[PDB]
Design a protein around this ligand. Structure first.
Ligand SMILES: Nc1nc2c(ncn2[C@@H]2O[C@H](COP(=O)(O)OP(=O)(O)OP(=O)(O)O)[C@@H](O)[C@H]2O)c(=O)[nH]1
Ligand SMILES: Nc1ncnc2c1ncn2[C@@H]1O[C@H](COP(=O)(O)OP(=O)(O)CP(=O)(O)O)[C@@H](O)[C@H]1O
Ligand SMILES: Nc1nc2c(ncn2[C@@H]2O[C@H](COP(=O)(O)OP(=O)(O)O)[C@@H](O)[C@H]2O)c(=O)[nH]1
Ligand SMILES: O=C(Nc1ccccc1)Nc1cccnc1
Ligand SMILES: [Ca+2]
Ligand SMILES: [Ca+2]
Ligand SMILES: [Ca+2]
Ligand SMILES: [Mg+2]
Ligand SMILES: [Mg+2]
Ligand SMILES: [Mg+2]
Lengths: 438, 423, 352, 54
């Protein structure tokens, strides 16, 4: 058994971290007080769930997590929330004034003064690991902390844990749930300085989560709680292989081996189905073929884009619940003859399939309904480059007038870091085009 | 605990600041004695932003009253909420400023500024994490204008990395006390260009026209004008005083694309005349809020373009219906919004409405139309300066004509800077 | 008030649609780079589809189907017909075609020569035509040596397809012609055929013993108006419309345009658009697409219809601009953005 | 349509289906970037104070 340390940076990372560990506990049968009746090895054990949880002598199962935010209001919720008992104070770090949505502020001005403290706390969790695999970093693109401080923490982690994998769960900015105008700046700045330090990044576009909540859950104006409970479901599906017995994606290295053949193109597309409203009278349960077919509908993708006009480099099917291989293969054959699925010529046209028999766990009183079987598809399409294009265009609109640049220069950043980071994105968009377009 | 230190200087500044504390004190449930008597926890959630908590659960505003004559602040102390202000926080002289910027900035004001900074330092020292400062004042007089901008220059020296925010009443010939107001306003505007992050422009002519043509007040008084400023000040600071899904520096980061163009046009809705009981719909609230007649900078927004817009909706209402009407105004008049700042129109909701209103809307615009205001002041300034009319009041205080020529050029620069971004 | 942008100043079709949109008083035009739009009359090449459908509260519509180039490219259409089971390689309405890359660059050279040698040996007519999308650049010849040697002198992909040696000739004149059909596909993927077509006729007698002078072989409106000396002789602008053409088919052939030709054209149009529907449909997309197509057909002396090509940015005959452009506003734009007959189209029902 | 590497356990199973075959900055350097930006902040603040002293 090898440990995984999760790190939550900024408001988005912390609140999404709060929602994930809530789910992890319900899934592994851990109570809010950290007790786990099913764990017969008290105060120890090298089980699959131990990759995410340590054990005290008293039988408490403590998440291998660190929460970092430059302002305390969000992390104070964790301290006084339902699962306050899970964590201890060392795991929660809070400053006193945030980065004001200013990448330069989170990375340089404030980051320089708090980086060594975060590393100290992370080292404390590492010292409990007999064989640390690496880190999972949850953060937003638009926040000054999520963008600015995350990219600094990723630079140092590569120094302090050179041989460790680093996966990201990143929140792509969406105007419908944002009041910041400079988020395109922050996103591109943090993608530039984090690109060579992240081995695999799962982007979630709030716009996608927003419409899924209105369309499938019938929520006219979704809140961050609605968004996070749905996001933690996808995160759970992605990290399930690390916390449960299995043979596919059993450690962080396998994520890059199975999903990222070319290093810079490490942004798999996530597609989840089904999302059914719990308020429904009662829904007809979808079959293996039906939910599998749903993985090629834009409506269920974590980033709205058109994979029909891209090329796949890899493709994983993660099933949870009542699923058997005979049905997966049958549905797969039916989808090829009906869908536009074009792989690159230097990759095999195949699907790696994982099946966990335990169906999805839903938070009591939440919005999602209990389903008998669900699936999350992780595919690496060039079509996700549509997301970089959108973001790079918004960047160009403001930067042509130098709008808001003084806020960044004022925190000690050089203006040339903008153009440097923008050319990197321009090169990243050219990489996708070379691989996907003829 | 993101505390704000409040300062009000001069006649206009202390009278408007007084009503402001009266308005928000009612919203937070603080009575004139500083005792809480509300019925919702939302009233106390962000109470420490503007109020200090004293012994016996008392709440004392974090405000410093400043003037060069005792008159106005005597009225404040005798006012309804006068007893709520810290007696120590009253700092005043006896000489007066004679509506003279030079007296407030160089002579009379300089003799008193250090004692004001002693009170400011005291209030900041007891802040867990001070956001920044907000100043209420007029630009047309002597104390709020001259000494007010002197205080800002000295506060930025001691707190260089804090946000400096002002509510600045701009003079108008239609609501005028003396003919030298364009002199004092031009001199102050340059100070604000340099030493403020956000300045809320409030034109006394807009307030007058709104009281006359809209509110239907035959003969508006200063009291009437201040009721509008009180309402507007409460609306713009709603983001700070109540819990919502924002700090001064974050507001500045999203409202100010260029350091010098940080002058905002506020707006309020409804503005009803005593048909006052009729429920106001979200479309109506939005249509008025963006209407020029509802704006308080006395500038037609359809003459320039919006760099950024921030709207705050208060009361129990359909947030889905709010997004639909906001997205309708942008998508129905996108010619007045610059197209090189994507999503430059933001909207926020607050569940607590103002006193006596089912729901209201406050408008904060960073519009290039604000240049028309500075243009008026500049013309009125040059009309006199070209003849050196009334300069002896200022040269007798130690000022030189050169300082006037530079203020004239500095403001004309500012107008040209707004002009380039309007095309 | 709806808003739209114009990003193709050279489109004669949507120049009229934009003129009509503004004439309704309910459509406002924005600068070509303003993102807050409902309708985009986009550019031809490199249209940024990825930036559509991401504006909160805006329903956005574009006049091009992403991926329709598979149908509107010379070599793309050939590869599509030969690789798509719905069309099959044995497609009876598409001339035998081959994709040939110049030797200075898969390629179907050997496959072409095999079928070419078979015809040469079987005494059969072996006249092919080499063309490409990079032309105004066409060569007609019965020798494969000249066809291939002509492509190598160029630097872009070409297509060699069988030349219709027995075309239907209009009388008097003994002259060739093609048929242009305008087709509109809306956001719901209804296939509407414009009731009005145009025959672009050659004003020169068809000569089967001299493919060197291509004036009587190429019915292009620009070739006839530049190198033909009988332009405008039999019909104005070498453009015979359906009313006249149908009357001719009755007096001469004792048949109608609907029976002898139009049924095959409607069948061809459905087969082509139904084939790529799963690849370009915007049914479940965050934005919506519609597009006008120009299908070009040939008719042989057996009254059998053949598909020549499909145009993705077609123009329209002068006499039909007002009717068709208004029709585009009705079923393609107002159906998504309604305003405050006897349709001019022919709905080709199909299974989605 | 081939299935390879079928792994079964008590809590699930995994396999691979094939449809068609194919055809850093050091710690020293990070500190320099951080301190360089801190120096540019100090210089700008000095000029501001220099301006205010005048
Ligand atoms: N899905 C989701 N998105 C969030 C959440 N909180 C914030 N965001 C998004 O994150 C972006 C804003 O960045 P934040 O994470 O709030 O900022 P930060 O990381 O705390 O950094 P600061 O500027 O110092 O506050 C916006 O696009 C929000 O929509 C959340 O709880 N869930
Ligand atoms: N296989 C074939 N047999 C007979 N004639 C052919 C032919 N291929 C092309 N032509 C002739 O060429 C003309 C059109 O050529 P083509 O359409 O390939 O070029 P083009 O695309 O520049 C014209 P357009 O785009 O307007 O249809 C027609 O008038 C037709 O008579
Ligand atoms: N809105 C408003 N404006 C005022 C008020 N009192 C004065 N003014 C304006 O302020 C300017 C005079 O400044 P004043 O405050 O009297 O000077 P000071 O006391 O020396 O700072 C003139 O333009 C007046 O119109 C007031 O109560 N409300
Ligand atoms: O006429 C005066 N100033 C002036 C005139 C024209 C232009 C510029 C300045 N000053 C004056 C007049 C009478 C008594 N004292 C002073
Ligand atoms: Ca154990
Ligand atoms: Ca590394
Ligand atoms: Ca004195
Ligand atoms: Mg934050
Ligand atoms: Mg006065
Ligand atoms: Mg063509």
């Amino acid at each position: 058994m090898r440990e995984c340390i999760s790190i939550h940076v900024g408001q988005a990372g912390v609140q999404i971290g709060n929602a994930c560990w809530e789910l992890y506990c319900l899934e592994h049968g851990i109570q809010p007080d950290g007790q786990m009746p099913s764990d017969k090895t008290i105060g120890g054990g090298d089980d699959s769930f131990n990759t995410f949880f340590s054990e005290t002598g008293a039988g408490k199962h403590v998440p291998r997590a660190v929460f970092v935010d430059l302002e305390p209001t969000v992390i104070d919720e964790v301290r006084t929330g339902t699962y306050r008992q899970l964590f201890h104070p060392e795991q929660l770090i809070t400053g006193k004034e945030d980065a004001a949505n200013n990448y330069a502020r989170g990375h340089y001005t404030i980051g320089k003064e708090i980086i060594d403290l975060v590393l100290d706390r992370i080292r404390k969790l590492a010292d409990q690991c007999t064989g640390l695999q690496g880190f999972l970093v949850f953060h937003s693109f638009g926040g000054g902390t999520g963008s600015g401080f995350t990219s600094l923490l990723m630079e140092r982690l590569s120094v302090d844990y050179g041989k460790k994998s680093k996966l990201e769960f990143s929140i792509y900015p969406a105007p419908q749930v944002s009041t910041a105008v400079v988020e395109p700046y922050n996103s591109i700045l943090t993608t530039h300085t984090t690109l060579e330090h992240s081995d695999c990044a799962f982007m979630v576009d709030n716009e996608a989560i927003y419409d899924i909540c209105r369309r499938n859950l019938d929520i006219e104006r979704p809140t961050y709680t609605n968004l996070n409970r749905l996001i933690s479901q996808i995160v759970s599906s992605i990290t399930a292989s690390l916390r449960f017995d299995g043979a596919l994606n059993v450690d962080l290295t396998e994520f890059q081996t199975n999903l990222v053949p070319y290093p810079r193109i490490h942004f798999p597309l996530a597609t989840y189905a089904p999302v059914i409203s719990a308020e429904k009278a009662y829904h007809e349960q979808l079959s293996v073929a039906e939910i599998t077919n749903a993985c090629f509908e834009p409506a269920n993708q974590m980033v709205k884009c058109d994979p029909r006009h891209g090329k796949y480099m890899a493709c994983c099917l993660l099933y949870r619940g009542d699923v058997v291989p005979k049905d997966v293969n049958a549905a797969i054959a039916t989808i090829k003859t009906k869908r536009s699925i074009q792989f690159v010529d230097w990759c095999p046209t195949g699907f790696k399939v994982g099946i966990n028999y335990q169906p999805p766990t839903v938070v009591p009183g939440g919005d999602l309904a209990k389903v008998q079987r669900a699936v999350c598809m992780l595919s690496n399409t060039t079509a996700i480059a549509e997301a970089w294009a959108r973001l790079d265009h918004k960047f160009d609109l403001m930067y042509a007038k130098r709008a808001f640049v003084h806020w960044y220069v004022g925190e000690g950043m050089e203006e040339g870091e903008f153009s440097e980071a923008r050319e990197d994105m321009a090169a990243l968009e050219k990489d996708y085009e070379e691989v996907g377009v003829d | 605990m993101r505390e704000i230190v409040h300062i009000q200087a001069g006649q206009c500044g202390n009278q408007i600041g007084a009503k402001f504390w009266e308005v928000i004190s009612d919203e937070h449930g603080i009575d004139p004695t500083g005792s809480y008597h509300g019925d919702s926890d939302l009233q106390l959630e962000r109470i420490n932003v503007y109020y200090n908590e004293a012994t016996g659960n008392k709440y004392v505003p974090r405000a410093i009253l400043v003037d060069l004559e005792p008159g106005t602040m005597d009225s404040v102390r005798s006012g309804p909420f006068g007893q709520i202000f810290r007696p120590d926080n009253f700092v005043f002289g006896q000489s007066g400023a004679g509506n003279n910027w030079a007296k407030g900035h160089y002579t009379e004001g300089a003799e008193l500024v250090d004692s004001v900074l002693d009170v400011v330092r005291k209030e900041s020292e007891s802040c867990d994490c001070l956001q920044g400062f907000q100043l209420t004042h007029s630009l047309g007089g002597g104390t709020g204008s001259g000494m007010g901008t002197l205080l800002i220059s000295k506060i930025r020296e001691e707190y260089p990395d804090r946000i400096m925010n002002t509510f600045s009443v701009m003079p108008s010939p239609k609501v005028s006390d003396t003919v030298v107001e364009p002199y004092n306003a031009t001199l102050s505007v340059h100070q604000l260009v340099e030493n403020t992050d956000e300045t809320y422009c409030i034109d006394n002519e807009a307030l007058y026209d709104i009281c006359f043509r809209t509110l239907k007040l035959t003969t508006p008084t200063y009291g009437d004008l201040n009721h509008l400023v009180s309402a507007t000040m409460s609306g713009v600071t709603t983001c700070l005083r109540f819990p919502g899904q924002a700090d001064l520096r974050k507001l500045a980061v999203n409202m100010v694309p260029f350091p010098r163009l940080h002058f905002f046009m506020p707006g309020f809705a409804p503005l009803t005349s005593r048909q006052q009981y009729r429920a106001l719909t979200v479309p109506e609230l939005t249509q008025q809020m963006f209407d020029s007649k509802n704006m308080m900078a006395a500038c037609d927004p359809r003459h320039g373009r919006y760099l950024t817009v921030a709207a705050i909706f208060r009361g129990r209402m359909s947030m889905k219906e709010v997004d639909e009407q906001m997205l309708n105004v942008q998508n129905k008049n996108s010619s007045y919004f610059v197209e090189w700042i994507p999503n430059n129109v933001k909207t926020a909701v607050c569940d607590i409405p103002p006193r006596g209103l089912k729901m209201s809307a406050t408008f904060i615009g960073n519009s290039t139309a604000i240049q028309e205001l500075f243009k008026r002041i500049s013309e009125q300034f040059t009309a006199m300066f070209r003849r050196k009319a009334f300069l002896h009041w200022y040269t007798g205080e130690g000022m030189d004509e050169m300082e006037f020529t530079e203020a004239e050029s500095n403001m004309n620069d500012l107008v040209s800077e707004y002009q380039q971004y309007q095309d | 008030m709806y808003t739209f942008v114009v990003r193709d100043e050279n489109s004669s079709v949507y120049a009229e649609v934009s003129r009509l949109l503004l004439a309704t008083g309910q459509w406002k035009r924005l600068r070509k780079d303003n993102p807050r739009f409902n309708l985009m009359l986009g550019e031809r090449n490199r249209l940024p589809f990825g930036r559509l459908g991401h504006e909160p509260g805006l329903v956005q519509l574009v006049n091009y189907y992403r991926g329709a180039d598979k149908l509107c490219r010379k070599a793309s259409l050939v590869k599509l017909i030969k690789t798509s089971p719905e069309l099959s390689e044995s497609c009876t309405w598409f001339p035998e075609s081959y994709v040939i890359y110049p030797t200075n660059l898969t390629d179907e050279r050997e496959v072409f020569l095999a079928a070419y040698n078979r015809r040469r040996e079987g005494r059969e007519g072996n006249v092919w035509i080499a063309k490409s999308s990079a032309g105004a650049g066409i060569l007609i010849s019965s020798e494969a040596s000249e066809l291939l040697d002509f492509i190598d002198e160029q630097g872009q992909v070409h297509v060699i397809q069988k030349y219709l040696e027995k075309p239907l000739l209009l009388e008097p004149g003994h002259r060739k012609f093609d048929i242009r059909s305008w087709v509109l596909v809306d956001h719901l993927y209804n296939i509407y055929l414009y009731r009005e077509g145009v025959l672009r006729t050659s004003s020169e007698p068809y000569n089967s013993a001299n493919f060197q002078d291509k004036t009587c072989h190429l019915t292009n409106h620009c070739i006839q108006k530049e190198y033909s000396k009988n332009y405008g002789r039999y019909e104005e602008g070498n453009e015979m419309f359906f009313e006249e053409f149908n009357q001719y088919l009755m007096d001469a052939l004792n048949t109608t345009l609907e029976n002898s030709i139009l049924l095959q054209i409607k069948h061809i149009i459905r087969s082509c658009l139904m084939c790529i529907e799963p690849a370009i449909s915007t049914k479940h997309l965050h934005y919506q697409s519609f597009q006008l197509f120009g299908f070009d057909f040939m008719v042989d002396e057996e009254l059998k219809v053949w598909l020549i090509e499909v145009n993705g940015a077609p123009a329209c005959a002068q006499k039909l601009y007002a009717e068709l452009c208004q029709g585009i506003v009705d079923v393609a734009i107002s159906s998504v953005f309604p305003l405050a007959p006897t349709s001019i189209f022919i709905k080709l029902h199909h299974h989605h | 349509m081939e299935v390879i590497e079928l792994n079964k356990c008590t809590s699930g199973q995994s396999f691979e289906v094939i449809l068609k075959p194919p055809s850093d900055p050091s710690l020293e350097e990070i500190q320099k970037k951080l301190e360089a930006a801190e120096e540019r902040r100090k210089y700008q603040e000095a000029e501001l104070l220099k301006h205010l002293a005048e």
